[PDB]
Amino acid sequence: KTVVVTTILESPYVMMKKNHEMLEGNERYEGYCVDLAAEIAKHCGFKYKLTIVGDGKYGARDADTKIWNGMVGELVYGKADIAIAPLTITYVREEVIDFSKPFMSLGISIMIKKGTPIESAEDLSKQTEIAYGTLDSGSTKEFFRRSKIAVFDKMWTYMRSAEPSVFVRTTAEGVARVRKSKGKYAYLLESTMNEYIEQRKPCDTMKVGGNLDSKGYGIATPKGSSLGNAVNLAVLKLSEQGLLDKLKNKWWYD
Amino acid sequence: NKTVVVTTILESPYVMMKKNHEMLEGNERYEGYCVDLAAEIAKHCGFKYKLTIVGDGKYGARDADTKIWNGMVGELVYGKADIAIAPLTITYVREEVIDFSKPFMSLGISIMIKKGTPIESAEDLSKQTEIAYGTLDSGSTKEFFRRSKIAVFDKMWTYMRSAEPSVFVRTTAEGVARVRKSKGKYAYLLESTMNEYIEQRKPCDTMKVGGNLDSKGYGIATPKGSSLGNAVNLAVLKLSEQGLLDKLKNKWWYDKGECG
Ligand SMILES: C[C@@H]1N(C)c2ccc(Cl)cc2S(=O)(=O)N1C
Ligand SMILES: C[C@@H]1N(C)c2ccc(Cl)cc2S(=O)(=O)N1C
Ligand SMILES: N[C@@H](CCC(=O)O)C(=O)O
Ligand SMILES: N[C@@H](CCC(=O)O)C(=O)O
Predict the structure, then answer these.
(1) How far is C-alpha A249 from the geometric centre of its chain's CA atoms?
(2) Do B234 and B171 fall into the same domain?
(3) What is the CATH number of the domain that holds A223?
(4) Are both A69 and A118 inside the same structural domain?
(5) How far apart are alpha carbons A193 and A110 in whole angstroms?
(6) Annotation-wise, does A117 bind a ligand?
(7) Which residues of A219-240 are buried (b: 16+ CB within 10 A; e: fewer)?
(8) How far is the CA of A184 from the centre of ligand 1 (A)?
(9) CB of A135 closer than 6 angstroms to any ligand 3 atom
(10) Where in this protein does the record say Phosphoserine is found (chain A)?
């Protein structure tokens, strides 16, 4: 009767507390999604255990084996009962799992070293001095692979063959490359993470131009889960009480 | 298979009467964002449909006494329509009685003023009484202020609910006209989508001030347990990821803007 929640280490959604080595269970973690999980469980009235996804991935279907990895796979293959994390609502995912109404908005955004002469995605697709890449096994990478839009298709064709790999396993990994590469690398990531980094030291990164798309994160359940309805209503309630806004302010507090 | 009844509402630029509507019939009488959206959705889910303007011209609220739903929500609840394709706001009380797809457009509650009006925030409105302000009836915006426990919004509700004469309007157009005619003495609380649209229409004498008071979206609504729900939801996501929804908003908001 304990609900297994799958989630992922991603600041400021889920982070390890200081001195977590002597802590146990859910008390090991803090962040936006940790608070969110507590509020949902309170409303739906269930006990839950937070577990970090084994592979540290969000969820992608390996075209070769047609096997889902990451948090999506955990739901699909019955390892978890619910995903509470910055998991992007997409078409391919909605085909295999259920999403609640979005609890937070985001768009794919460009992260440049401050001062970098880039103002748009067109600018990136018209230069080769500055490199660019995305996170592996995520919705951002799938966006460019699938985009039949002019600029985005060009950006993808460069990215898929880039040597060495412009793709990273973690968001933190992509952050460093923008910083190290002296303005020769632009990271493609979601505006939420981008806006978060923009506020943190050494404050040398910059969100540039508008978002490339418009979407949201949603709480995910296995298809035909009895938990789905109550969770969706919980999210809506929290939104209308303004609690989602206060959580955003709290963890993106400058 | 049967012709699907679509309930919707005459709200610019979502559903508008074509210039030659009087010599047109069926769905051909109408044009707008939601009309194009309905065509796209129907094509993917492979159904034929008939657009129907909701009888009472309301979005949907539940009578406190009779517990009866009006507007487009009522149409779905009592089985008069199979689907709603309109700027219908996703809310908690509505999700309890009908289903919504994932949102196809984002909005927040915003403030409309006549240009030059000394108001830059909702707190500015709550602090004064010289400038009156209100909302649309039978809609999600009015329910927001009625239900809010946030001090400034509750202060605004306490004012609005007892204001004389009534600061509430029956249509968006009535609300816009009231802003334009009141010489800066009326501000209108409406959804950012509507606000931004009007901002681009002649006489170009209004504007949106401050940030949005909340964050939500419009969704395609179906009766609970409808078999159309899944296909429609998937269709909305597909159109979103193809960039179709962004192109539709550009077409109806800014591609024909009249204020430069
Ligand atoms: C179709 C649908 N769209 C457009 C939007 C729009 C805004 C937000 Cl905050 C979330 C979503 S989503 O993730 O529910 N999905 C992609
Ligand atoms: C909870 C949920 N929230 C926060 C949001 C946020 C952004 C958009 Cl575009 C739509 C919605 S909604 O209408 O699906 N609903 C109110
Ligand atoms: N939120 C994304 C991961 C972040 C990214 O791909 O940039 C997902 O759900 O796949
Ligand atoms: N979109 C609102 C109506 C407009 C408003 O209330 O401002 C609704 O669905 O109730």
Answers:
(1) 18
(2) no
(3) 3.40.190.10
(4) no
(5) 11
(6) no
(7) bbbbeebebbebbbbbbbbbbb
(8) 32
(9) yes
(10) 147, 181
